């Protein structure tokens, strides 16, 4: 998540003040500049796990084509649950199941 100029709406780029030795975010079409809070200017993940469990919707229990199991919900302890494998579909994706209850909709595994 990156921020934008509050008066120009354009993207703010990181900058360093030579005299102050501080990190700043400065727009390019305007003189607006704001102090940087975090030092993590850039991050790149070679191996990532996002998109595995993020694929959750509140009304996934209304799908009739999804199998229904009897795994115990940690939160609601309901007798009815719906499970599915990982939404991320890379060639080396694990086959672990994600179980969703009909009340709390918490995603969990059998591991």
């Amino acid at each position: 998540s990156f921020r934008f100029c509050l008066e120009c709406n354009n993207m703010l780029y990181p900058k360093e003040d030579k005299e102050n030795q501080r990190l700043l975010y400065s727009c390019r079409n305007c003189d607006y500049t704001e102090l940087a809070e975090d030092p993590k200017v850039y991050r790149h993940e070679l191996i990532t796990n996002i998109g595995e469990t993020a694929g959750i919707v509140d009304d996934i229990g209304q799908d009739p084509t999804l199998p229904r199991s009897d795994k115990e919900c940690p939160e609601c302890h309901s007798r009815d649950c719906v499970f599915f494998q990982s939404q991320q579909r890379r060639k080396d994706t694990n086959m672990t199941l994600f179980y969703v209850c009909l009340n709390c909709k918490k995603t969990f595994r059998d591991e």
Partner: protein
């Protein structure tokens, strides 16, 4: 809407859109500003729907960096018009009008054709870019080409309609040519002779 740049190749992964009656590909930020959405925050709102998805944001960063040169609607329209494969030497005002013509019409015609109705086109461009990035990030399988629910069958109706449209356009052109030829005499043509 092509996504240039291979894995760890081609420097930035720029996105260039292809428009009808335009000779060269155009970066997506430029066409977005051409439709009339100049700030970058609004463009990101149009494309993405989850600010926490930093992966698609970092994929979009090179496109914004490339398109940063253009910062106004009229200049973007002029850039689109310059490559519009029209007559050479067209004036700037006529170039902008030609760009407006080629942007309102012939660009996603199935959505709309009337004026002041281009927000939907911007939203559909956002949807297309979202789908392209989503498949590029391997989050979804590429659309199946053999999926029989995405096919259509042309029965006698559509086939005869296409053929009749062609033949009727030919007949209309013949009537037009005969009218031009026969007005020179300034005669009251029966209009039953113009048709063939």
């Amino acid at each position: 809407i092509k996504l240039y740049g291979r894995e760890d190749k081609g420097t930035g992964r720029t996105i260039k859109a292809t428009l009808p009656y335009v000779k060269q590909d155009i970066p997506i930020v430029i066409v977005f500003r051409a439709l009339g959405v100049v700030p970058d925050g609004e463009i990101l709102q149009h494309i993405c729907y989850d600010e926490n998805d930093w992966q698609m944001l970092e994929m979009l960063k090179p496109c914004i960096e490339e398109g940063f040169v253009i910062q106004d609607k009229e200049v973007a329209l002029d850039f689109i018009g310059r490559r519009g494969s029209a007559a050479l030497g067209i004036r700037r005002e006529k170039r902008i009008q030609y760009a407006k013509d080629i942007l309102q019409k012939e660009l996603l015609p199935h959505i709309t054709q009337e004026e002041g109705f281009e927000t939907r086109k911007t939203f559909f461009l956002g949807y297309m870019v979202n789908r392209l990035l989503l498949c590029a990030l391997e989050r979804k399988d590429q659309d199946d080409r053999d999926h029989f629910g995405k096919k259509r069958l042309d029965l006698a109706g559509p086939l005869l309609a296409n053929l009749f449209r062609i033949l009727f356009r030919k007949l209309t052109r013949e009537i037009y040519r005969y009218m031009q030829r026969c007005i020179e005499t300034d005669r009251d043509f029966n209009l039953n002779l113009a048709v063939k």
